[PDB]
Amino acid sequence: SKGEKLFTGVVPILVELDGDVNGHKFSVSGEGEGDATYGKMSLKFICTTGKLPVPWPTLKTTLMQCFARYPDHMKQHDFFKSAMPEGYVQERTIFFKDDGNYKTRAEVKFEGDTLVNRIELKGVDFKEDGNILGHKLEYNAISGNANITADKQKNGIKAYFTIRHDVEDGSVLLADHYQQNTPIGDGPVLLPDNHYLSTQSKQSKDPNEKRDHMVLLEFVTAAGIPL
């Protein structure tokens, strides 16, 4: 793939999410720029249906691993860019410990020069009085590793990781992520050796924005293969 060639400069990003958590329907739209050369994404997300019925931090992982910086010695392990421009399906289940689960399905592909992430999210079995529907989570940076492995049989990848969400009482809400990505196209893709993506995030508010929103500055770096 000259999949990788589509990411050498700054790429416009569009995100669309339709969600239903315990029957509470909502939509999010996002925009920004990705600069994979520096593993960088600069984003702003809007709840387009009024108030988000779940905390922003619970949606971060759902709301474009194609923008990761793969060091030169690891470029042969970059499935995500290899599937472009036709794109990939990203499916997850996220199990929130002692609470509900999200099931997500996304299509990540180019529409002309724009990288588009279209997402549907279904959440079930949440506690109306719990840390999620009760909005008891810190609005603070998420960082850490996404472990990537080949899925030869599906010509794709699997991923797993646990996110540790800070709770306002000082406890941690564990969110166990199970991920499967498959190419949309039937052209060849790169099936990687085991590695991980290391994400560093800064999250903020726009003081002039009245809509429920989230501003993100993300840096994502492939790692786990030496040299």
Residue numbers in the entry: 2 to 64, 68 to 231
The authors write:
Recently, a fluorescent protein based on an anionic tryptophan (Trp) was developed and was named WasCFP. WasCFP was further improved to enhance its stability across a broad range of pH levels and temperatures, incorporating 13 additional mutations. This improved variant, which exhibits strong green fluorescence under physiological conditions, has been named NowGFP. Spectrally, NowGFP exhibits green fluorescence (λex/λem = 493/502 nm) at physiological and higher pH levels, contrasting with cyan fluorescence (λex/λem = 429/475 nm) under acidic conditions (pH < 6).
